Write a protein that binds this ligand. Structure first.
Ligand code: CA
Length: 276
């Protein structure tokens, strides 16, 4: 979730409210390639697959598409569609609606090539939902190296301080009956809490900052925040092997890619007690 600053600046400017030029690209010659009333069949396909791609069958369906055209035009356009959709989800839009709106616009495109949907590499933001992994994947191929943002609130963390023993170690260490600082960082397998987001981030480093306070003897309340250090998406497709499969990994290994920075801003407040 996380609202998003009032003045965030979408990467897919709305152009004319509703989809009209929003997604989809400049042309060449000549406005032909199939009759003029007809919807671009690449879009038709996307619309036929919307029930599947916007659900937990997404991966399976995509794998099948990749295999059928060898990561060709249909497959690329679908993948760029997932990013735009996932982005829109990050800006607060319902995913399936965004998806349709996107596909309908591609549908107005009169060419049949892999760039009939724009992938503007600017300001991308991962949503944390169903298509985030594909957005990050998208980005590694179409993003020309640009860093992008995956707000800490969208990762699905759910950090129990009490069972990270390095942290607790530090907490239990002589102190007054009041203040005392704690600022410690530590590795964390986003997989403890979310396997989707693990697909995109793997391990990250988190950081804990706050104080702790002691009562009667006694226990202690730490209240403070968690924050995250920027992670680096290694876009070499052999790192997605286990997730994407033999066929797709192989096809993707032909395609150029560039790793990029993922910034993870924000606070996750935390409060805890414990003892001895
Ligand atoms: Ca990582």
């Amino acid at each position: 979730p996380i609202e998003l600053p009032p003045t965030y600046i979408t990467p897919y400017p709305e152009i004319s409210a509703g989809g009209n030029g929003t997604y989809r690209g400049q042309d060449l010659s000549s406005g032909q390639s199939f009759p003029r009333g007809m919807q671009n069949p690449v879009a038709t396909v996307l619309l036929l697959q919307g029930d599947l791609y916007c659900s937990p069958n997404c991966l399976a369906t995509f794998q099948d598409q990749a295999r059928r055209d060898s990561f060709g035009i249909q497959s690329k356009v679908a993948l760029k569609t997932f990013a735009a959709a996932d982005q829109r989800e990050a800006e607060g839009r319902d995913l399936r609606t965004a998806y349709n709106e996107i596909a309908t616009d591609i549908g107005r495109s009169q060419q049949i090539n892999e760039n009939i949907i724009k992938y503007p590499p600017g300001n991308h933001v991962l949503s944390g939902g169903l298509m985030t992994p594909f957005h990050a994947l998208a980005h590694g191929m179409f993003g020309l190296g640009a860093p992008l943002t995956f707000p800490i609130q969208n990762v699905g963390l759910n950090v129990d301080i009490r069972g990270i023993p390095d942290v607790m170690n530090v907490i239990q260490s002589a102190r007054p009956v009041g203040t005392s600082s704690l600022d410690v960082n530590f590795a964390y397998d986003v997989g403890k809490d979310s396997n989707a987001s693990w697909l995109t981030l793997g391990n990250i480093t988190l950081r804990l900052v706050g104080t702790i306070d002691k009562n009667a003897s006694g226990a202690w309340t730490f209240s403070g925040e968690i924050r995250a250090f920027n992670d680096v998406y290694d876009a070499n497709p052999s790192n997605h092997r286990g997730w994407l499969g033999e066929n797709l990994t192989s096809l993707l290994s032909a395609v150029p890619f560039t790793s990029y920075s993922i910034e993870i801003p924000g606070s996750l407040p935390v409060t805890v007690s414990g003892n001895l």
